[PDB]
Every structure is written in C-alpha cells, then in structure tokens.
JSON list of C-alpha atoms and ligand atoms in Angstrom, two decimals:
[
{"chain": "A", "resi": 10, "resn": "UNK", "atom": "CA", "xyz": [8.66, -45.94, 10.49]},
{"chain": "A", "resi": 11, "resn": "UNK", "atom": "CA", "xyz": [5.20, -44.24, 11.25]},
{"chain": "A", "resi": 12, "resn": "UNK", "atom": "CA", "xyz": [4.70, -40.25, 11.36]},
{"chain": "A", "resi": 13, "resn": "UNK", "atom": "CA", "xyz": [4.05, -37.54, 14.18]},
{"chain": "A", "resi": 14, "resn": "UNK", "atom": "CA", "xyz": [0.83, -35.89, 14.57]},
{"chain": "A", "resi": 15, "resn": "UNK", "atom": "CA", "xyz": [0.98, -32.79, 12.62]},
{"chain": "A", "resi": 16, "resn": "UNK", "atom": "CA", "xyz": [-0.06, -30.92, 15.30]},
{"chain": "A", "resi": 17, "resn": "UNK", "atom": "CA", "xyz": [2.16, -31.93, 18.64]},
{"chain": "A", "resi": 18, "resn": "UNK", "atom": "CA", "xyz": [4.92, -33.33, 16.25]},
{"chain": "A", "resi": 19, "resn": "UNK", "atom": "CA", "xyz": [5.05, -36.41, 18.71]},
{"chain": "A", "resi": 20, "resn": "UNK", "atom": "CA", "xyz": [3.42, -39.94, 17.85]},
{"chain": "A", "resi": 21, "resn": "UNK", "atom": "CA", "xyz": [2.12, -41.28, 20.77]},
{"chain": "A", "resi": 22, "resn": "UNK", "atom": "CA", "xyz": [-0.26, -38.90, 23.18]},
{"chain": "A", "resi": 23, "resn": "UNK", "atom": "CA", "xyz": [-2.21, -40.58, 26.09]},
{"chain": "A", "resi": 24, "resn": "UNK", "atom": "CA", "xyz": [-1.77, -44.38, 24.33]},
{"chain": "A", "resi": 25, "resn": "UNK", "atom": "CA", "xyz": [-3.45, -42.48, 21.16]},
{"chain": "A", "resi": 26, "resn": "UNK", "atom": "CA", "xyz": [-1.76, -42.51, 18.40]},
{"chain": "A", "resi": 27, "resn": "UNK", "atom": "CA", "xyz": [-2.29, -40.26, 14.62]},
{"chain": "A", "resi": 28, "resn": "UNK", "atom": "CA", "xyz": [-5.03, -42.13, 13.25]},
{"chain": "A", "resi": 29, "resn": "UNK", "atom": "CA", "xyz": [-6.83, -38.48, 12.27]},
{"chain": "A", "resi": 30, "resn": "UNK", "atom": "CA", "xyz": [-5.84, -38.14, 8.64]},
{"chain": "A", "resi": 31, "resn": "UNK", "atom": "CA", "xyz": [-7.05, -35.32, 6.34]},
{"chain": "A", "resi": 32, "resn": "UNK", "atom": "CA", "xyz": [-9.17, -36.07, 3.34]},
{"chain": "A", "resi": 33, "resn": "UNK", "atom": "CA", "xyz": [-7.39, -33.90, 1.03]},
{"chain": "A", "resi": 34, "resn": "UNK", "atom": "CA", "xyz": [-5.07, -35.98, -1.74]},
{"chain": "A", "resi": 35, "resn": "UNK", "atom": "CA", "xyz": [-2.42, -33.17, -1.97]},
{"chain": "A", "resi": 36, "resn": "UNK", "atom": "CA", "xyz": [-2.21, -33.01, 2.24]},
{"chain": "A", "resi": 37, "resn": "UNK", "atom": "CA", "xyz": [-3.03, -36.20, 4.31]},
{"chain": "A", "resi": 38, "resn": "UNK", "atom": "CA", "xyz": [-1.39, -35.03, 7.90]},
{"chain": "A", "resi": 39, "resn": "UNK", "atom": "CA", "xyz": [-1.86, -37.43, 10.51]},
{"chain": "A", "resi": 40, "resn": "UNK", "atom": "CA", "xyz": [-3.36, -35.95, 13.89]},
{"chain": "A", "resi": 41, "resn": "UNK", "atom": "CA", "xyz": [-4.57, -37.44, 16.89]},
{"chain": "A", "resi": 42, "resn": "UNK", "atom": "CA", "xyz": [-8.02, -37.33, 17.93]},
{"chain": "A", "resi": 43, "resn": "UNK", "atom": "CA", "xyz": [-6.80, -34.90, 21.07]},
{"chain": "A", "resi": 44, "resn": "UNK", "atom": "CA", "xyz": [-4.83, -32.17, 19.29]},
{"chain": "A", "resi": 45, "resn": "UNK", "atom": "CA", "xyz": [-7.60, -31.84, 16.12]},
{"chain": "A", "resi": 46, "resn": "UNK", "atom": "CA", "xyz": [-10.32, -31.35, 18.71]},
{"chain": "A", "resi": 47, "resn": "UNK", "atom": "CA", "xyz": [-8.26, -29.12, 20.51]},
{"chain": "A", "resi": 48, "resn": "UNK", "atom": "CA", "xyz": [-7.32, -26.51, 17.69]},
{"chain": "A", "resi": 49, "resn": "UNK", "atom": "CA", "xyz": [-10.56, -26.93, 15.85]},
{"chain": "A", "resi": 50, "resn": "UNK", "atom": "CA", "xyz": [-13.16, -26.45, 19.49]},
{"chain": "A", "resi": 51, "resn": "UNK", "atom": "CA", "xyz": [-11.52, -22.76, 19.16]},
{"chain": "A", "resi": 52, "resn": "UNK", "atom": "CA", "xyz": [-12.45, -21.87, 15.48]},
{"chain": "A", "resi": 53, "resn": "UNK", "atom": "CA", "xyz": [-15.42, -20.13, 14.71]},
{"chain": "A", "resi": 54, "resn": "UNK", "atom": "CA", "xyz": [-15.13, -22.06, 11.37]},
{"chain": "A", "resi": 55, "resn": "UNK", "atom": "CA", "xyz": [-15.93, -25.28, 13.14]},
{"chain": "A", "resi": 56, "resn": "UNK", "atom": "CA", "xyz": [-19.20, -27.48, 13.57]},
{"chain": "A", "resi": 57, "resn": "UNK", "atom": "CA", "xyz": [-20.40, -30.40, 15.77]},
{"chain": "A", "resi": 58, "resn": "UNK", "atom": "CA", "xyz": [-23.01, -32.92, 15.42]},
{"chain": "A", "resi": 59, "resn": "UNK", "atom": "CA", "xyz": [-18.20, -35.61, 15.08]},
{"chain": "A", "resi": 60, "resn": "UNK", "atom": "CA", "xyz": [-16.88, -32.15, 14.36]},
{"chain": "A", "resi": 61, "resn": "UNK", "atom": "CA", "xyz": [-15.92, -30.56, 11.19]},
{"chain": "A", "resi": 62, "resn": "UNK", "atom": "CA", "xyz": [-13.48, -27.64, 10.69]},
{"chain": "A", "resi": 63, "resn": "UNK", "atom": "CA", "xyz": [-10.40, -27.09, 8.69]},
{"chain": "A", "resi": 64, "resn": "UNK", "atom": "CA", "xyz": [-7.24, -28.58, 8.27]},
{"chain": "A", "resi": 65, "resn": "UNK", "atom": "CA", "xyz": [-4.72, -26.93, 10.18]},
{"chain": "A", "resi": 66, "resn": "UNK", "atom": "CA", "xyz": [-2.19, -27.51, 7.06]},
{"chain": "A", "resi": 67, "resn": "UNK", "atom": "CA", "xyz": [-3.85, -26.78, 3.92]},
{"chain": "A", "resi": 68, "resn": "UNK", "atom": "CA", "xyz": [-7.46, -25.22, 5.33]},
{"chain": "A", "resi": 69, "resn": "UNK", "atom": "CA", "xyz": [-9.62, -27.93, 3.01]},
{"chain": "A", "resi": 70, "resn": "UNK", "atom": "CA", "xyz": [-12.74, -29.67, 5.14]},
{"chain": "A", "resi": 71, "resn": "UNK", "atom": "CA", "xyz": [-11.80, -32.24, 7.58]},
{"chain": "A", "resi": 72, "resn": "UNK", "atom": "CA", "xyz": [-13.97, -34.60, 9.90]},
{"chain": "A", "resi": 73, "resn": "UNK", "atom": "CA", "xyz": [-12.94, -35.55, 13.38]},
{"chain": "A", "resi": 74, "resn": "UNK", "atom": "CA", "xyz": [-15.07, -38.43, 15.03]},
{"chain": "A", "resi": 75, "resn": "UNK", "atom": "CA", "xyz": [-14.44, -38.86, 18.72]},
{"chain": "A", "resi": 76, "resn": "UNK", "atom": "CA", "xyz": [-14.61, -42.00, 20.86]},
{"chain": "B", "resi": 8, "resn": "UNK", "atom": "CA", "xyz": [0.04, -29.99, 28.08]},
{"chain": "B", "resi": 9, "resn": "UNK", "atom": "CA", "xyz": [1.75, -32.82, 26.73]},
{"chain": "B", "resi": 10, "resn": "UNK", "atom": "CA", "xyz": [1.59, -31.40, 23.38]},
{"chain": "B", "resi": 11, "resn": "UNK", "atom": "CA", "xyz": [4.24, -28.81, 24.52]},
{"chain": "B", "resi": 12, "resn": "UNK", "atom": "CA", "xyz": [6.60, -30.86, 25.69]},
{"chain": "B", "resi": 13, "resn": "UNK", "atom": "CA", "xyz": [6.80, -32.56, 22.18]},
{"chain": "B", "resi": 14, "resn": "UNK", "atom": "CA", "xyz": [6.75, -30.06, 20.16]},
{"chain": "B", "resi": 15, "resn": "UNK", "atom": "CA", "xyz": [9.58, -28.25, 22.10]},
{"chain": "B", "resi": 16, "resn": "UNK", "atom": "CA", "xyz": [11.35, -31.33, 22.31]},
{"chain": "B", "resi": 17, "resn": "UNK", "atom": "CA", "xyz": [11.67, -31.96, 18.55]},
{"chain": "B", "resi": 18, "resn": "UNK", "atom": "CA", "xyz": [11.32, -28.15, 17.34]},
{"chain": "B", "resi": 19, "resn": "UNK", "atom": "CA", "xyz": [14.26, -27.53, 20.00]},
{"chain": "B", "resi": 20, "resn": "UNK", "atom": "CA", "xyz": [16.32, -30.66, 18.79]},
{"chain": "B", "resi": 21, "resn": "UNK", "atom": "CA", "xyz": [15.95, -29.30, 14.53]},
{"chain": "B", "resi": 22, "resn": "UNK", "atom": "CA", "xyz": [16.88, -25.81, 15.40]},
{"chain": "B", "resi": 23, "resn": "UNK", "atom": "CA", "xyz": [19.72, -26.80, 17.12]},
{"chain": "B", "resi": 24, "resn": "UNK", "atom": "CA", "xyz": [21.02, -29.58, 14.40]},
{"chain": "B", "resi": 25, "resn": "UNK", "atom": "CA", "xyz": [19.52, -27.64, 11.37]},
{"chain": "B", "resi": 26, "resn": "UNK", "atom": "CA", "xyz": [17.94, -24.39, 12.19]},
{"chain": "B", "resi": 27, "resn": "UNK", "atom": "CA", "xyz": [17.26, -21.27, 9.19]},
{"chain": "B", "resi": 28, "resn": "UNK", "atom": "CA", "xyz": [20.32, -19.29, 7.87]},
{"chain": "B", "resi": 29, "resn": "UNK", "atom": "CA", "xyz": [21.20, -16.20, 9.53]},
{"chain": "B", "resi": 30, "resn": "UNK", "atom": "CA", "xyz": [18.44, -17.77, 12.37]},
{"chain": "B", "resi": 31, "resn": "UNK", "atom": "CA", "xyz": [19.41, -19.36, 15.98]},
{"chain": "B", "resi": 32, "resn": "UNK", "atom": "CA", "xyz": [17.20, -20.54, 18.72]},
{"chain": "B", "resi": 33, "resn": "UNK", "atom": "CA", "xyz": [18.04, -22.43, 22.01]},
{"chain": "B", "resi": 34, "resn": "UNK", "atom": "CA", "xyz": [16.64, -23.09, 25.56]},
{"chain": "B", "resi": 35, "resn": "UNK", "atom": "CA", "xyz": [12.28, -19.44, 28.35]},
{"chain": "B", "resi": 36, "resn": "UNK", "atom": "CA", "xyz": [13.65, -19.33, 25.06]},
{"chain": "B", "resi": 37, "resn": "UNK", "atom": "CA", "xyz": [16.83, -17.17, 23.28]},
{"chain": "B", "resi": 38, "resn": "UNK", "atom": "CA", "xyz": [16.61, -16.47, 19.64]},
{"chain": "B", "resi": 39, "resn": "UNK", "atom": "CA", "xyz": [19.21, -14.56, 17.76]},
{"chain": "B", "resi": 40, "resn": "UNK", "atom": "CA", "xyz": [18.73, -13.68, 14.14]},
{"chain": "B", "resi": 41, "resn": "UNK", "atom": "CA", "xyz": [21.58, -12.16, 12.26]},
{"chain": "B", "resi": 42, "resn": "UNK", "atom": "CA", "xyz": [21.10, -8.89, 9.69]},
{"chain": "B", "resi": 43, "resn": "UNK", "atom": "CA", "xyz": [20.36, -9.81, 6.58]},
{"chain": "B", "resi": 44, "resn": "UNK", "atom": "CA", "xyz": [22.87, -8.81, 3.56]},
{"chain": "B", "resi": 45, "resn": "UNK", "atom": "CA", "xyz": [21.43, -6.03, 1.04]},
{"chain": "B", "resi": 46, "resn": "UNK", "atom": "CA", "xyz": [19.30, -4.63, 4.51]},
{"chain": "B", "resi": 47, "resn": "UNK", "atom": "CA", "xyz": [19.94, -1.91, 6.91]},
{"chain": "B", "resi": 48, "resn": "UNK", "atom": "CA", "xyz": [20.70, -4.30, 9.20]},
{"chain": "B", "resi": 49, "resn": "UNK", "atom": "CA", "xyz": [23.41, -6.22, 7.88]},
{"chain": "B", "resi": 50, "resn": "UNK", "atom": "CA", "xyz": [26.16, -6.78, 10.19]},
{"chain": "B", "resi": 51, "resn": "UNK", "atom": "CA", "xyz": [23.74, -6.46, 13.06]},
{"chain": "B", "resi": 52, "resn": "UNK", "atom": "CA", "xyz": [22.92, -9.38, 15.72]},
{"chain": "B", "resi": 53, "resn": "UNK", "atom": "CA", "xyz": [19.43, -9.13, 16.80]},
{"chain": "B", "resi": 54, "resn": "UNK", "atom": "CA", "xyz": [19.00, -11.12, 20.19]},
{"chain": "B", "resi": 55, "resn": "UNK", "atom": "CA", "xyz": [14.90, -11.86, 20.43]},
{"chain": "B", "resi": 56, "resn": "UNK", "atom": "CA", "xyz": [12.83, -13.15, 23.75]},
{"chain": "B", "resi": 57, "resn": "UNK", "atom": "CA", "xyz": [10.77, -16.36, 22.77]},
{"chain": "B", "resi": 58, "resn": "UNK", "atom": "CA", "xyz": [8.49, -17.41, 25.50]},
{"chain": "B", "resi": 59, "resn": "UNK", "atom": "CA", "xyz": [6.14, -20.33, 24.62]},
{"chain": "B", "resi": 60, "resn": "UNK", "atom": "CA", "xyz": [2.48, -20.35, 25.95]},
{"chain": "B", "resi": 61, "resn": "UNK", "atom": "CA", "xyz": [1.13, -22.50, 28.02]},
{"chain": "B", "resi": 62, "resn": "UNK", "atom": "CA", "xyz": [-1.32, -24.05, 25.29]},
{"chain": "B", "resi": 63, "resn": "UNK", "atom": "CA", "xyz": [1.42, -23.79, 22.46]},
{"chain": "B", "resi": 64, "resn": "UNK", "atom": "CA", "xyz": [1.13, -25.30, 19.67]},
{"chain": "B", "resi": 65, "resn": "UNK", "atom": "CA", "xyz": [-2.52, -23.86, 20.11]},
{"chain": "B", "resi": 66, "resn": "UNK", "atom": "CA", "xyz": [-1.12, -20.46, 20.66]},
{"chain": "B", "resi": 67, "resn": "UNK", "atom": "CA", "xyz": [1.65, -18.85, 18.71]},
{"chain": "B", "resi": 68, "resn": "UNK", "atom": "CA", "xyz": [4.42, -17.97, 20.85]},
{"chain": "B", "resi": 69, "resn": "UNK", "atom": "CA", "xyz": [5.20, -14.46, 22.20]},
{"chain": "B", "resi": 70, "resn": "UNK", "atom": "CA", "xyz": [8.20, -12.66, 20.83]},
{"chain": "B", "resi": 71, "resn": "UNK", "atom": "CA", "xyz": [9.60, -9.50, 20.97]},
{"chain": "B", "resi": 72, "resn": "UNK", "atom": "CA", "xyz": [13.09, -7.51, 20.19]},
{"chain": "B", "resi": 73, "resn": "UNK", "atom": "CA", "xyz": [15.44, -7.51, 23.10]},
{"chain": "B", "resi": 74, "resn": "UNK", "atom": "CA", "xyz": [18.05, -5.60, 20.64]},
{"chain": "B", "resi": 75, "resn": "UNK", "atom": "CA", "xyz": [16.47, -1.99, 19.78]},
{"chain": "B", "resi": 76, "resn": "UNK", "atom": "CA", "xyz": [15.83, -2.05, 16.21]},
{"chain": "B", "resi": 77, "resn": "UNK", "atom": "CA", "xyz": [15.07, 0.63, 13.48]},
{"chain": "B", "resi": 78, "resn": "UNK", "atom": "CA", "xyz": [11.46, -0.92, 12.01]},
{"chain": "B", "resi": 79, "resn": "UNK", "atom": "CA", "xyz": [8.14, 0.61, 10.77]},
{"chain": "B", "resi": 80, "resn": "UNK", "atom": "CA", "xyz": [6.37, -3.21, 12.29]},
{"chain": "B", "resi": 81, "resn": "UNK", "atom": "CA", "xyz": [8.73, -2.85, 15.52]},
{"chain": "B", "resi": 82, "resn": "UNK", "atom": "CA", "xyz": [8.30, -0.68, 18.26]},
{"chain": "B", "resi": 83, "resn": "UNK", "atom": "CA", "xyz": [10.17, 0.72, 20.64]},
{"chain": "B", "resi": 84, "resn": "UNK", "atom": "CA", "xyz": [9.82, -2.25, 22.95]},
{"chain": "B", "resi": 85, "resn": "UNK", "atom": "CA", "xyz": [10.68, -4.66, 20.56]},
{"chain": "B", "resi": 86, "resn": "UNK", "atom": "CA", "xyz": [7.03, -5.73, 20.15]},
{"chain": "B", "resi": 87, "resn": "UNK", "atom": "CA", "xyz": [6.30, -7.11, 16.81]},
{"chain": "B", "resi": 88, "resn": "UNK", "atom": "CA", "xyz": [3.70, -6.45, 14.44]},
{"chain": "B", "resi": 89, "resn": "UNK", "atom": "CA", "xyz": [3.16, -9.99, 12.74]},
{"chain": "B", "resi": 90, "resn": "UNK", "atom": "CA", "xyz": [0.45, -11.57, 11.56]},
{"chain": "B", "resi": 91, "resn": "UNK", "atom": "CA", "xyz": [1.40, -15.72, 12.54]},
{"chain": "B", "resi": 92, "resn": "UNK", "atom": "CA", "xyz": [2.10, -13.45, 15.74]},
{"chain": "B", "resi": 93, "resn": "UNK", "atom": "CA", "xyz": [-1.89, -13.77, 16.67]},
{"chain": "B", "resi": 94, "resn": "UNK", "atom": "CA", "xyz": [-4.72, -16.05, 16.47]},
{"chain": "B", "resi": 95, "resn": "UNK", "atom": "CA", "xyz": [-7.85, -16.16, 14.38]},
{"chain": "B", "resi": 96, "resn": "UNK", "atom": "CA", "xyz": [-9.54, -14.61, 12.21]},
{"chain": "B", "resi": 97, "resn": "UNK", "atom": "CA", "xyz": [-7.73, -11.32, 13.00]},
{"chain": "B", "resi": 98, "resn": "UNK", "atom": "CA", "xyz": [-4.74, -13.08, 12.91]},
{"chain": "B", "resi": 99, "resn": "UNK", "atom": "CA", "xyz": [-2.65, -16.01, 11.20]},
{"chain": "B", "resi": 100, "resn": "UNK", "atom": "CA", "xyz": [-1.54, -18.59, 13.49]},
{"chain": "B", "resi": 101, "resn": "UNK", "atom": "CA", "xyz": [-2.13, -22.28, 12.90]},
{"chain": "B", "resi": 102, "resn": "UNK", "atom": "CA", "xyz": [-0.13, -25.30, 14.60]},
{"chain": "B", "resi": 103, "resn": "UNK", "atom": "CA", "xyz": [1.46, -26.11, 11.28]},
{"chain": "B", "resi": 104, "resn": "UNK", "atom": "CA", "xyz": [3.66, -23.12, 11.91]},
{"chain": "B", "resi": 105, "resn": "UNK", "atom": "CA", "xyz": [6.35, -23.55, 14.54]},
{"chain": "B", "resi": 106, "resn": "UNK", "atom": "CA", "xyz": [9.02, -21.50, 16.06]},
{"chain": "B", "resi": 107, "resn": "UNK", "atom": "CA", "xyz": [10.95, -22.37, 13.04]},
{"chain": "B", "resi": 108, "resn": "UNK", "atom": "CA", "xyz": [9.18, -20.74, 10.79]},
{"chain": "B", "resi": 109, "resn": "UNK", "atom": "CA", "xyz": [7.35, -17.41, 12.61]},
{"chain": "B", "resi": 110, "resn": "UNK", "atom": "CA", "xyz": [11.66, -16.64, 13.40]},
{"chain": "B", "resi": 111, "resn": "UNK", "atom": "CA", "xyz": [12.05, -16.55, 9.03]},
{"chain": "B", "resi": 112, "resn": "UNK", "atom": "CA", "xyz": [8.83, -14.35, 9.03]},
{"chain": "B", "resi": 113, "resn": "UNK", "atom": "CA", "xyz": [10.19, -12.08, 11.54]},
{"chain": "B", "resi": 114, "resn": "UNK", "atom": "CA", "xyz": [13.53, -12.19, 9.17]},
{"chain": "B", "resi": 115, "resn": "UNK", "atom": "CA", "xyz": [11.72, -11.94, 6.03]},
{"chain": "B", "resi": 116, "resn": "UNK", "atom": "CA", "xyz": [10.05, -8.62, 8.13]},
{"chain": "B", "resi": 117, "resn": "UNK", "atom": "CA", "xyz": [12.89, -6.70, 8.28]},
{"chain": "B", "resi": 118, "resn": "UNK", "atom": "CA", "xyz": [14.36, -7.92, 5.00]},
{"chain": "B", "resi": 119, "resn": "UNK", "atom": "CA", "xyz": [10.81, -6.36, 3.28]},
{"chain": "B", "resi": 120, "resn": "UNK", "atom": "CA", "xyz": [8.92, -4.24, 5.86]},
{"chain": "B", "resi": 121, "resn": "UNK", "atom": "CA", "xyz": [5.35, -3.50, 5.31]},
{"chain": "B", "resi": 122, "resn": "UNK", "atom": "CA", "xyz": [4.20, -0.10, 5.49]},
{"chain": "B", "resi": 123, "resn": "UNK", "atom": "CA", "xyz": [0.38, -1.06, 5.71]},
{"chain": "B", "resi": 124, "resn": "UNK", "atom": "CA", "xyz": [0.95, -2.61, 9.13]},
{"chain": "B", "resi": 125, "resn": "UNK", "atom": "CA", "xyz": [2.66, -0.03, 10.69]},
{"chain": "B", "resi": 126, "resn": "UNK", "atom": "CA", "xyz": [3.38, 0.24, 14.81]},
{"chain": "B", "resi": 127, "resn": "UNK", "atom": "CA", "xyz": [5.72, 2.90, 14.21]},
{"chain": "B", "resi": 128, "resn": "UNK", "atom": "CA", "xyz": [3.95, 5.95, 12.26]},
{"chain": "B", "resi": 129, "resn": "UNK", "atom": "CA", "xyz": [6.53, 8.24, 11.89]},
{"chain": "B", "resi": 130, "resn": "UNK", "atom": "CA", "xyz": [9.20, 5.46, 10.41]},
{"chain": "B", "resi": 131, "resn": "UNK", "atom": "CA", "xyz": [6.27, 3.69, 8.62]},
{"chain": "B", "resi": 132, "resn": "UNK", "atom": "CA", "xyz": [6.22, 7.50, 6.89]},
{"chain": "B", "resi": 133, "resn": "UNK", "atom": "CA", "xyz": [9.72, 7.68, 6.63]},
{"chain": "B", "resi": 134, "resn": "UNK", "atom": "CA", "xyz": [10.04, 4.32, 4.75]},
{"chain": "B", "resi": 135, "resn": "UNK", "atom": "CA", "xyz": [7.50, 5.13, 2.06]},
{"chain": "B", "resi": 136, "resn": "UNK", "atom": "CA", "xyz": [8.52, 9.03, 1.33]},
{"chain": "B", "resi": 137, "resn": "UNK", "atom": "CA", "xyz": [12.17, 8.88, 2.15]},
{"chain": "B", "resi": 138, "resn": "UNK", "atom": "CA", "xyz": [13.91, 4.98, 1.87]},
{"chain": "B", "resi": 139, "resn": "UNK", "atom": "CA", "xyz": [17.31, 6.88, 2.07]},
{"chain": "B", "resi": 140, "resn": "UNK", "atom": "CA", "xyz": [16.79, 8.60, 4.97]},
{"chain": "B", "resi": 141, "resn": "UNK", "atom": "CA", "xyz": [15.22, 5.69, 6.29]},
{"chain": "B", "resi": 142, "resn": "UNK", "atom": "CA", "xyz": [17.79, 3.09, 5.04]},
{"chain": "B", "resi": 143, "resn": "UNK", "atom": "CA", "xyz": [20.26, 5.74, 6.92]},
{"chain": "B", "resi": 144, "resn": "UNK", "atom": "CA", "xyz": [19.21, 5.75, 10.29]},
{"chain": "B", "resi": 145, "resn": "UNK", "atom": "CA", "xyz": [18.32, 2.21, 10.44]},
{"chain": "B", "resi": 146, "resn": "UNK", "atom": "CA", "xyz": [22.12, 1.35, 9.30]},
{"chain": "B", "resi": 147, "resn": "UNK", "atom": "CA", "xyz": [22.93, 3.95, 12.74]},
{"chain": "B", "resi": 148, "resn": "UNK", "atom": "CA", "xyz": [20.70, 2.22, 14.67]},
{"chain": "B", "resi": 149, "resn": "UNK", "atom": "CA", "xyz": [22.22, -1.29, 13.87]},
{"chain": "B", "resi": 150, "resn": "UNK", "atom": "CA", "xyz": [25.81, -0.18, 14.53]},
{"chain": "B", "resi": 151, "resn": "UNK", "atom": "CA", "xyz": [24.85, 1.56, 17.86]},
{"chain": "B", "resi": 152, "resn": "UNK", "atom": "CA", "xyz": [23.08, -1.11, 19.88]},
{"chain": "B", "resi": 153, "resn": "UNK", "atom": "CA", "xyz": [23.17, -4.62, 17.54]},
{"chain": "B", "resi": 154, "resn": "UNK", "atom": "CA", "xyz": [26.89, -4.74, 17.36]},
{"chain": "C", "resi": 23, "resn": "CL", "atom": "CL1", "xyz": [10.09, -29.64, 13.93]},
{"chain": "C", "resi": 24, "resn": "NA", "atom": "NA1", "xyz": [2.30, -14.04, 19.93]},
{"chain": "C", "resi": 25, "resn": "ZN", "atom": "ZN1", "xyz": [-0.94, -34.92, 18.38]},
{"chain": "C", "resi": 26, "resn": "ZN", "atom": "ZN1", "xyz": [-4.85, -31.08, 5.06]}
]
C-alpha cells in the first residue's frame, strides 16, 4: 500500500513517484515533483528561487524543490 | 499528458463502480444527472457533454447542457455559469476537484440557483420576484424536452 499523487491520482509518472508532501498537519497530499510544478508555474500566487505556491488541497504554503 | 490518462482512468473506473446519487458519467465524455426531488426538475433526465482538456487535471473540464433546461446560471446553449467551471483567480478550479465533484456542483446548481451569477437576466429576475412563476415554467420546461 502507498498513495496516488493528489494531483494525477496515479503513483508512478516518468519512474517518479509522490515524494512531494504538503507541510500542513491537517493535509499531507502526496504529489510528484511533475504535477506540483505544473499547477503551481501557472499561479500568480507562486514564487521561485525551489518554488513556493499553494497547496492545491487545502491552499496552506507548500515548497517544491526540483532535481 | 500522462496525467490525463490517470486521472481518467481511475475517475472513469469510481464513477462507474460508485459515482454521486442522482449523477452518471461514462466514456468524449456522457454525463447524465437526474432532477432532483423538492426542484423544478424532478422527474427530469438531464443528459450533459463532458469533454476533458488537453492539460486536465490542470484545466477544469468543459461542460455544458445537451438537454434544454429552465436556469437563471444556464443558458440557452446549455453553457454553464460555474465557478470550479474556470481557472484562477477569476475562477475556482484546482486539481483536487475532479469530474466527480464539478457534476454535484452543477446538481447542487439547479437544486439552489444563484441569482448573483446570472447568464439568463430575465429568469435570474423571474427567480428572485416571482419563484412561482418561475418554479412553473421550469416544471414545463422539464416535462417538454428532459422526459
Ligand atoms: Cl477518483
Ligand atoms: Na470549463
Ligand atoms: Zn502526479
Ligand atoms: Zn495541503
């Protein structure tokens, strides 16, 4: 047992798994790397140094490092 | 666009073994949603178009009335005034909404229509200064082209 990406409900993308998990205690989706940059590139919300926008679930702060 | 494939293959799979009361939605896509008890539109089948963007789940999907309906958010042409409908900031679409759940908006829509979104002026009017009359001809509308 091990869960879907929040975002394209599927668990393995491109030999990438979830391993993008929001900070928030009272939400902790899973996403992969791909579909958090993806949704959060878009958002006028978001900022990149690592990128930081808003979790698609419950809209608190999250961090996405790429590699 | 991997990411479509897998959502549609697991959002197609749970609407088909457990999808919303009253709410259907199979392979473009078909959705039917039935009319809602204690609304106009009670005893009414509503067939709906669902076509799914190329960058779905980063886009919400198109849909639209292919039953005429009786609606101060639904025109004429069965577009839908809905904000999950459209993207950011002017609308409401995020990929933790699916196909799922924008169909039980689009039910809860007609079960409680809002006025303050209107795409049809003259039945947004009619809802807020004469339900009856309203309530009326949406019932006439149902039984002459949902059933
Ligand atoms: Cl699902
Ligand atoms: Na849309
Ligand atoms: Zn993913
Ligand atoms: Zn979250």
């Amino acid at each position: 047992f091990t869960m879907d990406c929040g975002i394209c409900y599927a668990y393995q993308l491109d030999g990438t798994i979830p391993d993008q998990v929001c900070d928030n205690s009272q939400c902790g989706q899973p996403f992969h790397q791909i579909c958090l940059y993806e949704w959060l590139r878009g958002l006028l919300t978001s900022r990149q140094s690592i990128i930081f926008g808003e979790c698609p679930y419950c809209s608190k702060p999250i961090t996405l490092k790429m590699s | 666009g991997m990411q479509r494939a897998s959502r549609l293959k697991r959002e197609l799979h749970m609407l088909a073994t457990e999808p919303p009361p009253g709410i259907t939605c199979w392979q473009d896509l078909r959705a039917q949603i039935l009319g809602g008890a204690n609304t106009p539109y009670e005893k009414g089948v509503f067939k709906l178009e669902v076509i799914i963007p190329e960058r779905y789940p980063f886009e919400p999907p198109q849909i639209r009335f292919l039953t005429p309906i009786y609606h101060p958010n639904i025109d004429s042409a069965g577009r839908i005034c809905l904000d999950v409908l459209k993207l950011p900031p002017k609308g409401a679409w995020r990929p933790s909404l699916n196909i799922a759940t924008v169909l039980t908006s689009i039910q809860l829509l007609m079960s409680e229509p809002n006025p303050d979104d209107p795409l049809m002026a003259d039945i947004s009017s009619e809802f807020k200064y004469n339900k009856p009359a309203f309530l009326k001809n949406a019932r006439q509308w149902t039984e002459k082209h949902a059933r």
